[PDB]
Ligand binder design. Structure first.
Ligand SMILES: [Mg+2]
Ligand SMILES: [Mg+2]
Ligand SMILES: [Mg+2]
Ligand SMILES: [Mg+2]
Ligand SMILES: [Mg+2]
Ligand SMILES: [Mg+2]
Ligand SMILES: [Mg+2]
Ligand SMILES: [Mg+2]
Ligand SMILES: [Mg+2]
Ligand SMILES: [Mg+2]
Ligand SMILES: [Mg+2]
Ligand SMILES: [Mg+2]
Ligand SMILES: [Mg+2]
Ligand SMILES: [Mg+2]
Ligand SMILES: [Mg+2]
Ligand SMILES: [Mg+2]
Ligand SMILES: [Mg+2]
Ligand SMILES: [Mg+2]
Ligand SMILES: [Mg+2]
Ligand SMILES: [Mg+2]
Ligand SMILES: [Mg+2]
Ligand SMILES: [Mg+2]
Lengths: 129, 88, 218
RNA sequence: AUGUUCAAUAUGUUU
RNA sequence: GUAAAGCGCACGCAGGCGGUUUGUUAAGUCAGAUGUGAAAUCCCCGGGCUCAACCUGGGAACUGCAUCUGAUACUGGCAAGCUUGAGUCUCGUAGAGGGGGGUAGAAUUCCAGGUGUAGCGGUGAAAUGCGUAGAGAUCUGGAGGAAUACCGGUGGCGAAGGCGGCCCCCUGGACGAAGACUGACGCUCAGGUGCGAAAGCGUGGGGAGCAAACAGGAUUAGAUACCCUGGUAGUCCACGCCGUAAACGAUGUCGACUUGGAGGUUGUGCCCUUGAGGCGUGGCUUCCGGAGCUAACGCGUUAAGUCGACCGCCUGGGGAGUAC
């Protein structure tokens, strides 16, 4: 009954990419906006919006490189039934480094490479390959 | 059941005003009125299992609202249970 | 815009959901195609036709319905190209190896009917042989003198002639097809959203492709 | 109309 | 789903999980440090036995634990909110949803009577059987019980089981439009609790028809079967007990997202209602099919597709779902 909106955001992205929808809109949130910022800077998603005040909607523009999706596989790792925190040296390497692993660290939500650069780990939100 | 006049009387008696009809006290009072009412219907219609299912749904709804009221504000909880005649 | 013709709208509720960006707003249970997207892709198809006929071309024309047949014949023969105005034989291109032999048999029958011995044999055998030649011309008339393999396939009905589309796709021969509202616009390399039922619309299409390939002939 | 049963077995190749 | 495997169905305590914002804490989490984590062993760089095994020097590791100082993104606790979840109220709609009571008609059977007469009944064919003591057939009157033709519909309602003549009484749920209202009060659920077809059991009624068992007649090699003629429990009612079904969409519940087509049913808004029409918007529902998935069959917005929460279950076939 909607017990992981982060996974719902991820599966919305996945379904939209599979259905070749240009945009995907969802109930926005601060964590969702952080993750979408991470994806937009890392190149897996086009620009996005957080429009709306009393019931905000997050509108993400999806990317298609040739005719195929850019987001290959976006997998939720730390689901609310099993939380997964990793140390600095234990942070994963999705697709042997050429994919990202969005992780929430004390200095905000950042990718695996960024968390390793900053020397701290956290809660592994998701694997975006 | 629990005709418009009786339920509006309970609303006015248990709420902020007559417009305030969704507050926990009014919801619990309406469920309690309906339960006390249906006790008579199930006094002789013992084999009305399909209606008693809805009655038990009402009982569980009233208990969930009472738990919410208790862990939300204990003063209102005590006031409502003593004003309504509850606790076994 | 409506440059000419009646290719602005066609098939009803039987629309392929994949033909969404070209359906314009169907008015009365009939899906109108968006000309604002039809005309630029049509000129793109014609530009690729110009380019591939600059390479001396081998442009098959695949129209098999009882509307497109004679227009296809006229357009292909008017320019110089090859055509299929009847049922598409399964394997004309992918199984070209054994259809080359039926074409050779057709040409043998034809040269014998011209200056051979179709007259100096049994009357029954002879009628059988002229009827077999008739079948071979009715089917392989356009591919008769068609050298080797094609270079592009102008298909008129993507839904009706989808065996030719699928047969060109696995050979990589490009496909310029008129994709109606009820058709599958996937095997088509260069789609041309339009009407098919209208003989006049298909004649517009065939005049366009004939003129453009004649241009490309340098 | 109804109308039962049947014990266990071979096989074989290249520039 | 069909290979073993979704509890029959729901309710619900512990339990697990939990919408959105701000503040606060710092428990989890993360970072560093201190102490420790015996030695050997394992590993790495060497070094000594002619080599190697072996020995040994120095590291590394001992992925752990508690304490200290820090971060506050996420999880958690507290405080305050918020409304998109979830509920409440107003009006209305449809419905074999349930419980109680009362009637209606058709028909079967029996009884009493009239006409009338030698057949009836049954089958593959017969016979048992009923009939001159007068059947069967036909009409009149009465009794009694059970089920409700037509409507009737891949229609409706219900958590499932299941529920269809009409009427009344008591009652549950669902959905729709517009608004207000409370403000996460939610999802799931081991144990537990309740409902749970048919058969069956107990007590008391009832008993038309049908009919296990039973009897007879056939069939047969035999026929403790199919078939025929009868026929008792039972089927019915009240209240208890059982608690199981191929209790089955063989598909747990809840939520989110992802092309379409043809319907059915029940709401609702508007437009030319310039009719019963057109255009939308909801709930439930039947069939076909796209992507995807699948061993395939097939499922396919009511998924067996893409995910999240919780639960139940499976681990070769028999033995055996038996034994104790
Ligand atoms: Mg024998
Ligand atoms: Mg099985
Ligand atoms: Mg089930
Ligand atoms: Mg609980
Ligand atoms: Mg939360
Ligand atoms: Mg801490
Ligand atoms: Mg040691
Ligand atoms: Mg040495
Ligand atoms: Mg050390
Ligand atoms: Mg915190
Ligand atoms: Mg917090
Ligand atoms: Mg408020
Ligand atoms: Mg249980
Ligand atoms: Mg019981
Ligand atoms: Mg029974
Ligand atoms: Mg009994
Ligand atoms: Mg019998
Ligand atoms: Mg069972
Ligand atoms: Mg059943
Ligand atoms: Mg089952
Ligand atoms: Mg299907
Ligand atoms: Mg047993």
């Amino acid at each position: 009954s909607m017990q992981d909106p982060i996974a719902d955001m991820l599966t919305r992205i996945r379904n939209g990419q599979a259905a070749n929808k240009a945009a995907v809109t969802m109930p926005s949130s601060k964590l969702k906006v952080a993750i979408a910022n991470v994806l937009k800077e890392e190149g897996f998603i086009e620009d996005f919006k957080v429009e709306g005040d009393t019931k905000p909607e997050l509108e993400l523009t999806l990317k298609y490189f040739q005719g195929k999706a850019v987001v290959e596989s976006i997998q939720r790792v730390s689901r609310p039934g099993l939380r997964i925190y990793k140390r600095k040296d234990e942070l994963p390497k999705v697709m042997a480094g050429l994919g990202i692993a969005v992780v929430s660290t004390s200095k905000g939500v950042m990718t695996d490479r960024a968390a390793r650069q900053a020397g701290l780990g956290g809660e592994i939100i998701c694997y975006v390959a | 059941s629990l005709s418009t006049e009786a339920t509006a009387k309970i609303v006015s008696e248990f709420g902020r005003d007559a417009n305030d009809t969704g507050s926990t006290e009014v919801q619990v009072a309406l469920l309690t009125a309906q339960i006390n009412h249906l006790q008579g219907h199930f006094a002789e219609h013992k084999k009305d299992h399909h209606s008693r299912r809805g009655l038990l749904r009402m009982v569980s709804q009233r208990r969930k609202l009472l738990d919410y009221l208790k862990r939300k504000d204990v003063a209102r909880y005590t006031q409502l249970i003593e004003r309504l005649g509850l606790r076994r | 815009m409506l440059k000419a013709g009646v290719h602005f709208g066609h098939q009803t509720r039987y629309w392929n959901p994949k033909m969404k960006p070209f359906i314009f707003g169907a008015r009365n249970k009939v899906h109108i195609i968006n000309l604002e997207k039809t005309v630029p892709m049509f000129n793109e198809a014609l530009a690729e036709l110009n380019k591939i006929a600059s390479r001396k071309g081998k442009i098959l024309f695949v129209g098999t319905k009882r509307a497109a047949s004679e227009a296809v014949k006229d357009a292909a023969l008017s320019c110089d190209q090859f055509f299929v105005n009847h049922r598409w034989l399964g394997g004309m291109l992918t199984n070209w190896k054994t259809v080359r032999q039926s074409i050779k048999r057709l040409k043998d029958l034809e040269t014998q009917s011209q200056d051979g011995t179709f007259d100096k044999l049994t009357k029954k055998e002879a009628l059988m042989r002229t009827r077999e030649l008739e079948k071979l011309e009715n089917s392989l008339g356009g591919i008769k003198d068609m050298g080797g393999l094609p270079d592009a396939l102008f298909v008129i009905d993507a839904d009706h002639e989808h065996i030719a589309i699928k047969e060109a796709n696995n050979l990589g021969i490009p496909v310029f097809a008129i994709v109606d509202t009820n058709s599958d616009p996937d095997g088509v390399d260069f789609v041309i959203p339009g009407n098919d039922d209208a003989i006049r619309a298909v004649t517009l299409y065939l005049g366009a492709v004939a003129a453009t390939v004649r241009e490309g002939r340098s």
